[PDB]
């Protein structure tokens with residue numbers, strides 16, 4: 001009899017309660033689950049963005065429909081990330097500057113690009129730009145979602161009819177609270193209030209119990225560290241080193257707040273914005289009646305007061321009379337996410353600036369992979385080693401992807417933007433950029449959207465597809481040196497492919513003209 005009987009989780013934020021809920025649903029009565037609150041510092045709800053797999057991987061597993069959980073956490077919709085002013089110099093401002101007679105913005109939507117002759121639509125767009133017969137931006141040519149988002153449409157018709165692939169904006173504290181109620185009332189997880197006095201270990205350094213300040217020993221076989229940047233178990237108790245990656249991603253601070261919004265004026269933007277600043281970038285996460293916003297910056301390039309004032313100036317806030325969250329970031333990951341019988345999940349495990357909304361996703365993936373590699377009490381090394389490799393490969397892949405946004409940006413007008421070009425580029429990303437310039441697809445999707453979004457593992461093995469690389473590279477002004485050479489041998493395939501551009505144009509009109517506003521759906525939902 002070697003199976004796990006007791007699990008103890010340290011930390012009661014988003015990571016803690018997502019972990020408690022999922023594992024309790026997965027294991028049922030076979031395991032007792034106990035979560036020790038370890039109270040975190042109370043922050044303004046500054047918003048959080050997600051990716052589509054959240055519903056299928058997580059909420060569907062718990063049996064919770066969006067119609068049920070979204071009203072409980074004031075959730076709203078995300079169709080893309082909108083990048084503002086990453087090509088033009090200037091101050092940190094909310095509005096896009098003008099470049100070549102167009103606003104300086106580009107979108108990074110979800111979903112997979114359609115293909116013709118098994119070549120992605122991106123390559124036909126590149127061919128037409130090279131041929132000089134179009135001057136249309138990549139995102140407006142290849143995604144119908146762009147038109148929807150400019151007209152601030154919902155991603156669905158009011159009666160549930162799907163239109164476009166989407167994810168969510170919400171206040172993470174409300175979600176944690178909703179999940180806490182769910183896990184304790186429905187999944188028989190025991191919530192224990194208070195601080196951890198000490199962590200009890202045996203002769204082999206495995207954890208045997210968490211001792212609470214009232215002297216109670218929370219005994220277990222497996223321990224999940226969800227204590228955030230503190231890493232109270234994985235870093236402090238187990239002495240696992242954290243690998244600082246601030247050398248590669250310079251931003252390490254944020255100043256943030258939530259701002260009340262009059263939605264009747266201009267609606268609710270169904271996308272997360274990432275607004276380029278003098279020494280970093282600011283997020284905007286719109287929900288009904290209010291949006292969350294924060295300036296992510298690098299302390300090597302801006303003073304605290306500088307950032308704070310720039311942030312407030314952009315939103316027209318009085319810096320003296322505005323509640324602000326001032327946060328220092330831990331950028332990087334543990335050498336290993338799982339050590340002995342301690343598994344770190346969430347900020348305890350790793351962190352990147354939220355440029356592409358990876359936070360909740362990293363938790364979800366960690367949770368999912370923990371169940372895929374779930375141990376018994378022998379704790380076979382091959383299980384944790386495999387888990388650690390998947391977590392490491394996931395993190396480093398996205399870290400490199402994020403770095404590319406700053407490296408490929410043409411901006412050089414401040415020391416921050418200029419310093420990004422001086423940073424070492426990882427060999428794998430150097431290769432990707434050279435492939436892209438030669439006209440090759442990068443990580444082309446080989447399945448349809450139904451398979452990709454249907455099976456988590458299909459997406460996990462191909463998370464940043466060709467579409468995403470084109471969104472960012474073409475978005476930032478980088479195009480291939482020449483189109484895919486094989487296309488010059490297939491003119492008939494090229495002539496045929498143009499109908500797909502006509503289809504996107506048709507969808508763009510249809511969506512704008514018949515979809516309800518994001519605002520209207522949110523009011524019907526809430």
Ligand SMILES: N[C@@H](Cc1c[nH]c2ccccc12)C(=O)O
Nearest residue numbers: 051052108109110111356357463
């Ligand atoms: N695998 C993700 C990739 C992705 C596309 N667009 C994004 C925008 C933000 C974050 C991730 C993404 C998805 O298709 O959903």
